[PDB]
Amino acid sequence: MSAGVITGVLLVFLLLGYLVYALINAE
Amino acid sequence: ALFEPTLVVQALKEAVKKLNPQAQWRNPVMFIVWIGSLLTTCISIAMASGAMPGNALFSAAISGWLWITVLFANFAEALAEGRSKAQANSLKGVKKTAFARKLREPKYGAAADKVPADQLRKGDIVLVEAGDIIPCDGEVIEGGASVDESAITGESAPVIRESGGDFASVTGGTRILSDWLVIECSVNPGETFLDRMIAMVEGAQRRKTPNEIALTILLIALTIVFLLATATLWPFSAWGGNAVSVTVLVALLVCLIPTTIGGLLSAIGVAGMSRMLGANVIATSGRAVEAAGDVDVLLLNKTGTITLGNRQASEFIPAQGVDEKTLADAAQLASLADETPEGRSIVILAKQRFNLRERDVQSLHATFVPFTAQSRMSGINIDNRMIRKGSVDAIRRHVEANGGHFPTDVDQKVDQVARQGATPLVVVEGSRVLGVIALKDIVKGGIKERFAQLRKMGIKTVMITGDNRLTAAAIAAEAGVDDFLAEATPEAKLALIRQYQAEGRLVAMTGDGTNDAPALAQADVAVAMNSGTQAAKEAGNMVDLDSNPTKLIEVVHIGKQMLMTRGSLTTFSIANDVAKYFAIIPAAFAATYPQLNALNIMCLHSPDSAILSAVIFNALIIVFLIPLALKGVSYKPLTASAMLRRNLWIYGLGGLLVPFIGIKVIDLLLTVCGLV
Amino acid sequence: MSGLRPALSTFIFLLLITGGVYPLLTTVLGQWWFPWQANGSLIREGDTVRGSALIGQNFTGNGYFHGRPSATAEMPYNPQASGGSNLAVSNPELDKLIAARVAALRAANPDASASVPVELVTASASGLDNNITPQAAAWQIPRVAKARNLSVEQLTQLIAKYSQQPLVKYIGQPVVNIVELNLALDKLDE
């Protein structure tokens, strides 16, 4: 919707991608 | 290790502020908390400025408590590594190292120029004379004497480093009050196990075990599902009315993520490794640390005698007429050649009863014979009265060979010792008996029910020994092991290890001599012996500083305690989320769905206070569980199903009941103190 | 992978087995063993059909045993659009519909009990259901008796003749086949 919704969606997607990468590559 | 020293805690408060994202990147479970803390801090700053509507104080308190949570997790982790570093450099014994004199030839009298640590290498020779700290590890060559090995053991008891014998290896710097003993530095300083342990604790090189990274994978999966559940509440509640504010979503997220185990996992690992370091065992890898508690078959091996039994407590009562000072001197001189923990504790208790300590062994040039399991009777040979000690039957055979008899007083004293419960040991000057000493049992019955508990865990304890088979059966009967193997060749030992590993069972082995190196190299767990060889020390992966082969069961206990602590805290952090829901969900939806107040199982004050109390509890539970993570769980040896039942009854019910009480008490405190 | 001929071969064989011969075998076995059950269970009166014994029909006459409401599309009992109204208990539209049905049934049944059965006011799962409980069927026998000049015991005997029960009472409910009961009423009147 608005800019807040867009930046929330991108923040949640970035955190989800970071956690997926962490699960795939267990450092 | 009082677990809260003033200097350690203040340096911890100094060093916990290193919470930059470059160091929080490697932990995703708490990088989520850090990102949420920064996001809510920006939101609170925006509300204070006036860019968005709000109250700018509830969000600020939530931000401060989330920062307090991440600071508490870093507090726990850095406390564990600080305690590990303190223990490591406390057991470090290089210290001054400002006097390392050289020797030209291996003979008394050479160029003794004292230069401080002038690049000592493997194969060099140095000298110490009445007070000089040992420069580097090696083997004594000629004229060895009594040294005060404390920097590697923790006891101020005198231990002789006999030249050309079992007591050849010297470990680290120590105190020497006699003189004229030559050693040969067979290794360079830096590749020793002490230096490797120092280099491993001095830095961030603390690479996690495979089971640890599996646990982090589970924590990351829980983090992903909780992040999705909290992030999808904005459309779900935004359609039904006003949208749920972002700070409540972030606070519910942080209350949902397994923050307890996610911040205490590194603390658990480092605390367990430091606990095993405090058990006089130095390891080289956390994988080996966990594999120690992961064994199924246990090998208790030494090239010489075995005599599995501690019997540390003693009484030292002749009731004869000869004074206890000379009794203790006799026992100390007889047991100075004994590397067993029984003789070591006899010397320790004699020292702490009367200050004998150094005895000037080179005064009479005594020849030393070690303990023999085939005779169970040994001593030294100062003069014609060859003073000796041993078991009752062996000393009776000795005194009948020498032409003597047992006095009725010492017979009654042996009877009293046997009735009270001990193994009667008596020292004899070689021509006339002095008095029996007691070896009081360790805790309840000692090694026998400890092995019974280990077999109740389904852990095989195979007796390995090098003496004859007839005495090995008696030693096995005294210890409590199910089966034995005597005079085993190294090829047969390696074949037995490969046969036990062929079915998949992990193996743990003790080893001293250089002939045990091929077995210890391919063994899953290889605890070396300081009474053995440096070659075997480097071949193995763990070093025992007490020179006791019975410490393997304690190492197994520590390795199991680490895993039990990990699982218990993981299940506690998972089960806390039920009360987190019962505190947050009826209060998060206050203006969207006003009918969602019947789910408030706890009569909480306000929606603005329920989430705040939940976040306060989520912050405080890490501090309240720091002592649990440092100590480990209460280890009760039982059947595996019984341990599962006990751990469930404690920790699952704790996760299902303790957060209810904690959140209720925190909300009650907030209401009676007027913060909310 | 590199194996594609076995994949296509077994897919063609499994298609030709699961569709085709298996429906053909089931069809020939059904039409050989159970006619009037494999064909639609139609009730026939000679070169015509009055509907099946299973689907159910929209009955609104005064002398007919009324069934459950249906709430299908474009017609009350329309087999071309199955599935009843998916109104929740929280929907006020369902409350309005139930209130209207209760008012209509109470107006149409002056000499019966004011407690309307749930069967006659709640729409069925499918809109096609010629089944009501015998209590709901006996709830309507004063109106049918008044509109058809029949006896209460005669209507009860007709219902009990046209009521079907399961093998055990707890895997289902006793039901009354509405369509053939009304057809039996028509034949009894004629």
Next chain:
Amino acid sequence: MAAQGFLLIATFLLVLMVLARPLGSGLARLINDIPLPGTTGVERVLFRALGVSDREMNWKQYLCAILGLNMLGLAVLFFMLLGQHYLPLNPQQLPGLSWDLALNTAVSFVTNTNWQSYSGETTLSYFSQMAGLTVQNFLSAASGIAVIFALIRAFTRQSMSTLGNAWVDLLRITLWVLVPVALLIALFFIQQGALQNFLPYQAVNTVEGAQQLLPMGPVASQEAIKMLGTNGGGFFNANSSHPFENPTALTNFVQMLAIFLIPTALCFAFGEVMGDRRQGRMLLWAMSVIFVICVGVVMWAEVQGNPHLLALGTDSSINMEGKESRFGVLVSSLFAVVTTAASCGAVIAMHDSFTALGGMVPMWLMQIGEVVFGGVGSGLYGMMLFVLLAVFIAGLMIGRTPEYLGKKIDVREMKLTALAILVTPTLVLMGAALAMMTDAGRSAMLNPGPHGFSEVLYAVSSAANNNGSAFAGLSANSPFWNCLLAFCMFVGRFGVIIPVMAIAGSLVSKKSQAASSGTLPTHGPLFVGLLIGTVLLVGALTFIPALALGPVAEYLS
């Protein structure tokens, strides 16, 4: 009504176990690559004719075989539905489906979900419902049983690489398990009154004087495999409550038995193949306790149904709205829980017209992963991920290494088990979130408020968890809904099949240690309760907020 429900559950479970134990004994032979008695001799010549040579292949080739068969079925079903009016057996001359609906009901039928956003009595033709729907109802079920066969073989094989032949397994399943049972079930349905014919639609002059059109078609042959394969793809719009499709309470009982048949049979076969039946007993107890609790809760919440019915002038407050008459409230509640927990899209009672609390428990069983007698094979390898998590947690409790059935479970299997656990609730939450922002997703609402959000959440979880049961009030024939749900079904089946086969390929490489006293007993009431607590806690901690904003809000409103 308290004793009738208990007797119903008791006799259902008793007849189910009695019927399913011999089927488990039969399925153990197919798992152990042993031909069935009498099927040999013709099996070899059939394999020689079809071109399969019993090539023992690994997990990658097995997965590629299953996936290639599924995409071939998807392509042929999509083309069959697009070019429907060119095909024969179309007495009503129905036009070809639109692209969105055709793709939706092609991916839906291939991915063993059988979501139906249409009305089959006036949407699809006889040839379509004969050779594209029944074929995929057989093939998706056979694919699920083949994947669970691979998983059980991986658990039971010692230090190998191969995992059997996928084509041989599929042929064995759908020729000696599915068809011989579905034939008897279809013939019994025909005898009870279900339809099996190819006549055109019969024009009916009713008693009153109006006209209605009765739809015919091969209904019973489709319905037999629809029940047996836990499929739920109905011939008509009323998915399993049509009198031409579920005519008798005896037919309903056979339907429930067929729905739980192959899950229970596969649990028994898993117990038998290891040689230790206690593992299958453990799995069956862990499923059955949750199943009985859920059935009791739903029965009580439906008996204490509509509160407005008692005060609005009716006789009792029982919830009979959206329920049939030949099947009672208790029977409809039991069927709802059976189909919804078993990943079967069959509905007798319209789940949208349920009580909020009585419809929350089916959707809870749906959102915890189809593990309580779930799916057809798919429930069994969805159950062995919670089992792997349980043995991991219990191993950390007891201090030993995490292992199950004598096989060590390492970091790679933790990665794959975590991903397979993650994939379906992620799909439910993101799909519901996407549907609750778009106006095209929020315009399909029928009931207003928390029940409408429950409708959207139920539809998304039905697509993602491969169930097919629907809150039928949602108008999901929109292109956005069709594409979103088709994507959800596709990736929610093939993001569980792939990690489970990777787990199988990891498990074949290891060998089982001997069960010493140090290994915890995986059977027993302790581990049954631990596994139940694990699956309930994992499925609850990820969906309590959604349930609170949906059916709990509707119940407390």
